[PDB]
Design a protein around this motif. Structure first.
Motif, PDB file in Angstrom:
ATOM      1  N   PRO A  13      -0.492  -7.903 -11.020  1.00  0.00           N
ATOM      2  CA  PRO A  13       0.832  -8.060 -10.254  1.00  0.00           C
ATOM      3  C   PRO A  13       0.883  -6.979  -9.095  1.00  0.00           C
ATOM      4  N   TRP A  14       0.383  -5.752  -9.295  1.00  0.00           N
ATOM      5  CA  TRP A  14       0.641  -4.622  -8.389  1.00  0.00           C
ATOM      6  C   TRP A  14      -0.417  -4.898  -7.179  1.00  0.00           C
ATOM      7  N   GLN A  15      -1.413  -6.001  -7.280  1.00  0.00           N
ATOM      8  CA  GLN A  15      -2.259  -6.021  -6.402  1.00  0.00           C
ATOM      9  C   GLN A  15      -1.950  -6.073  -4.926  1.00  0.00           C
ATOM     10  N   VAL A  16      -2.114  -5.509  -3.911  1.00  0.00           N
ATOM     11  CA  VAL A  16      -2.147  -5.729  -2.702  1.00  0.00           C
ATOM     12  C   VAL A  16      -3.089  -6.051  -1.670  1.00  0.00           C
ATOM     13  N   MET A  17      -2.640  -6.778  -0.592  1.00  0.00           N
ATOM     14  CA  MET A  17      -3.590  -7.043   0.281  1.00  0.00           C
ATOM     15  C   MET A  17      -3.057  -6.222   1.833  1.00  0.00           C
ATOM     16  N   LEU A  18      -4.001  -5.687   2.360  1.00  0.00           N
ATOM     17  CA  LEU A  18      -3.883  -4.681   3.509  1.00  0.00           C
ATOM     18  C   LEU A  18      -4.251  -5.816   4.600  1.00  0.00           C
ATOM     19  N   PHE A  19      -3.595  -6.290   5.437  1.00  0.00           N
ATOM     20  CA  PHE A  19      -3.840  -7.300   6.384  1.00  0.00           C
ATOM     21  C   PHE A  19      -3.408  -7.157   7.834  1.00  0.00           C
ATOM     22  N   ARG A  20      -4.506  -7.299   8.431  1.00  0.00           N
ATOM     23  CA  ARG A  20      -4.659  -7.298  10.028  1.00  0.00           C
ATOM     24  C   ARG A  20      -3.816  -8.522  10.671  1.00  0.00           C
ATOM     25  N   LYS A  21      -2.837  -8.125  11.386  1.00  0.00           N
ATOM     26  CA  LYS A  21      -2.188  -8.891  12.159  1.00  0.00           C
ATOM     27  C   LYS A  21      -3.076  -9.422  13.256  1.00  0.00           C
ATOM     28  N   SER A  22      -3.825  -8.860  14.082  1.00  0.00           N
ATOM     29  CA  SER A  22      -4.700  -9.519  15.021  1.00  0.00           C
ATOM     30  C   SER A  22      -5.931  -8.516  15.305  1.00  0.00           C
ATOM     31  N   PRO A  23      -7.387  -8.906  14.865  1.00  0.00           N
ATOM     32  CA  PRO A  23      -7.472 -10.380  14.478  1.00  0.00           C
ATOM     33  C   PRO A  23      -6.727 -10.183  13.272  1.00  0.00           C
ATOM     34  N   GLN A  24      -6.576 -11.571  12.631  1.00  0.00           N
ATOM     35  CA  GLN A  24      -5.995 -11.664  11.285  1.00  0.00           C
ATOM     36  C   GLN A  24      -7.023 -11.484  10.175  1.00  0.00           C
ATOM     37  N   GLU A  25      -6.990 -10.422   9.603  1.00  0.00           N
ATOM     38  CA  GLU A  25      -8.170 -10.259   8.530  1.00  0.00           C
ATOM     39  C   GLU A  25      -7.721  -9.075   7.547  1.00  0.00           C
ATOM     40  N   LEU A  26      -8.160  -9.516   6.568  1.00  0.00           N
ATOM     41  CA  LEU A  26      -8.420  -8.428   5.348  1.00  0.00           C
ATOM     42  C   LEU A  26      -9.095  -7.195   5.604  1.00  0.00           C
ATOM     43  N   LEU A  27      -8.227  -6.211   5.446  1.00  0.00           N
ATOM     44  CA  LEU A  27      -8.745  -4.805   5.737  1.00  0.00           C
ATOM     45  C   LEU A  27      -9.124  -4.170   4.444  1.00  0.00           C
ATOM     46  N   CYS A  28      -8.356  -4.295   3.320  1.00  0.00           N
ATOM     47  CA  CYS A  28      -8.728  -3.710   2.128  1.00  0.00           C
ATOM     48  C   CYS A  28      -7.560  -4.083   1.075  1.00  0.00           C
ATOM     49  N   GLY A  29      -7.674  -3.411  -0.273  1.00  0.00           N
ATOM     50  CA  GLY A  29      -6.909  -3.781  -1.646  1.00  0.00           C
ATOM     51  C   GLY A  29      -5.743  -2.567  -1.449  1.00  0.00           C
ATOM     52  N   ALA A  30      -4.854  -2.325  -2.175  1.00  0.00           N
ATOM     53  CA  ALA A  30      -3.905  -1.323  -2.232  1.00  0.00           C
ATOM     54  C   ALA A  30      -3.022  -1.770  -3.482  1.00  0.00           C
ATOM     55  N   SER A  31      -1.891  -1.192  -3.774  1.00  0.00           N
ATOM     56  CA  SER A  31      -1.346  -1.588  -4.791  1.00  0.00           C
ATOM     57  C   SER A  31       0.235  -1.098  -4.898  1.00  0.00           C
ATOM     58  N   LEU A  32       1.193  -1.685  -5.611  1.00  0.00           N
ATOM     59  CA  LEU A  32       2.762  -1.623  -5.513  1.00  0.00           C
ATOM     60  C   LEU A  32       3.003  -0.546  -6.719  1.00  0.00           C
ATOM     61  N   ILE A  33       3.591   0.759  -6.398  1.00  0.00           N
ATOM     62  CA  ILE A  33       3.821   1.618  -7.604  1.00  0.00           C
ATOM     63  C   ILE A  33       5.311   1.729  -7.514  1.00  0.00           C
ATOM     64  N   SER A  34       6.000   0.852  -6.494  1.00  0.00           N
ATOM     65  CA  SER A  34       7.489   0.898  -6.522  1.00  0.00           C
ATOM     66  C   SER A  34       7.907  -0.253  -5.462  1.00  0.00           C
ATOM     67  N   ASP A  35       9.059  -0.639  -5.337  1.00  0.00           N
ATOM     68  CA  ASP A  35       9.583  -1.784  -4.643  1.00  0.00           C
ATOM     69  C   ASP A  35       9.541  -1.347  -3.089  1.00  0.00           C
ATOM     70  N   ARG A  36       8.990  -0.198  -2.575  1.00  0.00           N
ATOM     71  CA  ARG A  36       8.950   0.187  -1.498  1.00  0.00           C
ATOM     72  C   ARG A  36       7.635   1.013  -1.137  1.00  0.00           C
ATOM     73  N   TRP A  37       7.014   1.312  -2.172  1.00  0.00           N
ATOM     74  CA  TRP A  37       5.710   2.264  -1.740  1.00  0.00           C
ATOM     75  C   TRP A  37       4.535   1.397  -2.390  1.00  0.00           C
ATOM     76  N   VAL A  38       3.422   1.544  -1.463  1.00  0.00           N
ATOM     77  CA  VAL A  38       2.155   1.124  -1.697  1.00  0.00           C
ATOM     78  C   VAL A  38       0.964   2.093  -1.647  1.00  0.00           C
ATOM     79  N   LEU A  39       0.120   2.230  -2.813  1.00  0.00           N
ATOM     80  CA  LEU A  39      -0.890   3.089  -2.805  1.00  0.00           C
ATOM     81  C   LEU A  39      -2.200   2.549  -2.239  1.00  0.00           C
TER      82      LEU A  39
END
Lengths: 253, 10, 36
Positions: A13-39
């Motif tokens: 559930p902490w899994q995050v997608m780092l996504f490119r607005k344009s071109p629209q794409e998957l740049l990397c994974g990341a993760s939620l450690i709080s409701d406002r912070w991503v690692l």
């Protein structure tokens, strides 16, 4: 993920997608450690050699996802980043030492069945679990093949922590204390690894003591994907924790 | 391949 | 956020929270010489 399996719904559930607005794409994974912070890994943001230098602007964060490609209508939450902080001594120049970055979300995410923070390891969690042989878990929407597919669903793989000397002798690169490697030994006839698009994701361990999931590593680098006598290198989260603390109570949540 | 997201987001 | 995470950190709504176990968690715990 090379030789993983589809993630179950709400398994990470902490899994995050780092996504490119344009071109629209998957740049990397990341993760939620709080409701406002991503690692994430600083290399997903900054990579001079590759001329990579993402600005808070260039990006989007997608939380709650199962599917790689589809916009997950009422389950996923997509945020805009307020701010990016890269580790002051991240070494893109030589070995990616301190491959870590924090992202402050423009607005706090609300938790739900598919969105929930992972815990940061305390010094003792780190001590009891970060041991050679102990298995951790990696997740991502990355490459399934070093080279050839692409998953349509989040993949998972359980990897043993490999002792330092082995990590060291597997490469020409200079390993630091802010790194740990993970992977099966060719002797072991069990495979798996992170692959392109997996970077910045979490290397999590489940504590046997309090039965909570902790994020021990950050998918950092490797040579090829799932190669024999090679291992995945992850940022040692506990070691960079003071840095983490610092930035959160400086300008954060 | 990627689906499109609301430009409430873009 | 930090210091051994968030609060309810690392407690999954579909798993830990309903006392459901994912399909391979056991492999992890069994490497720690079986969990708790």
């Amino acid at each position: 993920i090379v030789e993983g399996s589809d993630a179950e719904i709400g398994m990470s559930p902490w899994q995050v997608m780092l996504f490119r607005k344009s071109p629209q794409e998957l740049l990397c994974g990341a993760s939620l450690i709080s409701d406002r912070w991503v690692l994430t890994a600083a290399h997903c943001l900054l990579y001079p050699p590759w001329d990579k230098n993402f600005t808070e602007n260039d990006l989007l964060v997608r939380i709650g996802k199962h599917s790689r490609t589809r916009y997950e209508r009422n389950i996923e939450k997509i945020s805009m980043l307020e701010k990016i902080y890269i580790h002051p001594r991240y070494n893109w120049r030589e070995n990616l030492d301190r491959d870590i970055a924090l992202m402050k979300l423009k607005k706090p995410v609300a938790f739900s069945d598919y969105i929930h923070p992972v815990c940061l390891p305390d010094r003792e969690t780190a001590a009891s679990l970060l041991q050679a042989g102990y298995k951790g878990r990696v997740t991502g929407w990355g490459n399934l093949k070093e080279t050839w597919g692409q998953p349509s669903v989040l993949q998972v793989v359980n990897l043993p922590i490999v002792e330092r000397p082995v990590c060291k002798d597997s490469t020409r690169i200079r390993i630091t204390d802010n790194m740990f490697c993970a992977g099966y030994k060719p002797d072991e006839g069990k495979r798996g690894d992170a692959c392109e698009g997996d970077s910045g994701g979490p290397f999590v361990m489940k504590s046997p003591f309090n039965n909570r999931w902790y994020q021990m590593g950050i998918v950092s680098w490797g040579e090829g994907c799932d190669r024999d006598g090679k291992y995945g290198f992850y940022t040692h989260v506990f070691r960079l924790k003071k840095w983490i603390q610092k930035v959160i109570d400086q300008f954060g949540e | 391949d990627f689906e499109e997201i609301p430009e409430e987001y873009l | 956020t930090f210091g051994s995470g968030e609060a309810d950190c690392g407690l999954r709504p579909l798993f830990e929270k309903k006392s459901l176990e994912d399909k391979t968690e056991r492999e992890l715990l069994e490497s720690y010489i079986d969990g708790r």
